[PDB]
Amino acid sequence: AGSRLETVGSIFSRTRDLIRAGVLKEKPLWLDIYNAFPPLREPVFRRPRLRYGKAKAAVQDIFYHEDRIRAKFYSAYGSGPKAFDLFNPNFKSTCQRFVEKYIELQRLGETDEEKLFVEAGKALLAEGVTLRRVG
């Protein structure tokens, strides 16, 4: 009839070897599509063993240089007056405007953090957004 063993291996191997041995005399329709377009990983069963000791996951945290400016903005003024709109793909926030000012102030040859911070804070007033510093 077939092979109902999961831990032995993948379904493709268990169909192909059955047909090679001659037990399954009828080709399943999906075998040809598997042969034509195989997936990236063979669907073999792998048991989720727990990770003990000093071993740790290999995923690396997502952090950019703009996060350093965003942390200062949120520490000084907190959340911006313009509420965040996650539906808009091209939405730019007050913190985004602040970091866009910060990068150009860096390109202007300014190395001091106070100069990069207060000048951007005052420059935002030119466009006319309200900054609410948290005391």
Binding site: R4, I11, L29, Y34, P48, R51, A57, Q60, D61
Partner: protein, 177 residues
């Protein structure tokens, strides 16, 4: 999950982000495999245990002309077919998982039974899913309404195009002689 490490881009302040490069690379093969089974007159069944969008799954399956299972999965459904469904039935040739986990946060019954019965399984696997048994896993999001609607529309059009092009291929077959 421990087996989602290669399918992730990183972690954004505790929340893990799935990279979409391998998501699209997997989804191309997933849609191609789904469309080929429909082209070759195969039974395709949408298994999904999630009590938020189940109505949307039956609507999508009915519009596709394929079958759906979004309710409580019985024990010997896929294994004890000659008893649960009828005397002699035809097993589904392809299983689409929109939610690999049930309401208990355990792996679904059908992902194990399809591997037991040598039934191809294509599935949207979240960061807490187990892709070891799914033949065609696609790392994505199954809890967002826009994501699940996108996946349902993609799998709807993949079946629709496959069936229609089968009809024009048969039409040309009739004119061949």
């Amino acid at each position: 999950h421990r087996f989602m490490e290669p399918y992730l881009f990183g972690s954004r302040l505790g929340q893990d982000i799935i990279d979409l490069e391998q998501t699209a690379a997997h989804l191309q093969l997933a849609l191609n495999f789904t469309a080929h089974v429909a082209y070759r007159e195969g039974i395709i069944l949408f298994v999904s245990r999630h009590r938020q969008f189940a109505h949307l799954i039956e609507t999508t399956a009915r519009d596709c002309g394929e079958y759906a299972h979004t309710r409580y999965f019985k024990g010997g459904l896929l294994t004890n077919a000659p008893l649960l469904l009828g005397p002699g039935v035809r097993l589904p040739d392809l299983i689409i998982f929109l939610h690999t986990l049930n309401n208990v946060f355990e792996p679904h019954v059908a992902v194990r039974d399809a591997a037991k019965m040598n039934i191809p399984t294509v599935g949207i696997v979240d960061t807490n899913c187990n892709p070891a048994l799914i033949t065609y896993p696609v790392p994505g999001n199954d809890d967002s309404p826009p994501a699940v609607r996108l996946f349902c529309r993609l799998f709807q059009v993949a079946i629709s195009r496959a069936k229609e092009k089968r009809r024009q291929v048969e039409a040309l077959y009739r004119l061949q002689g």
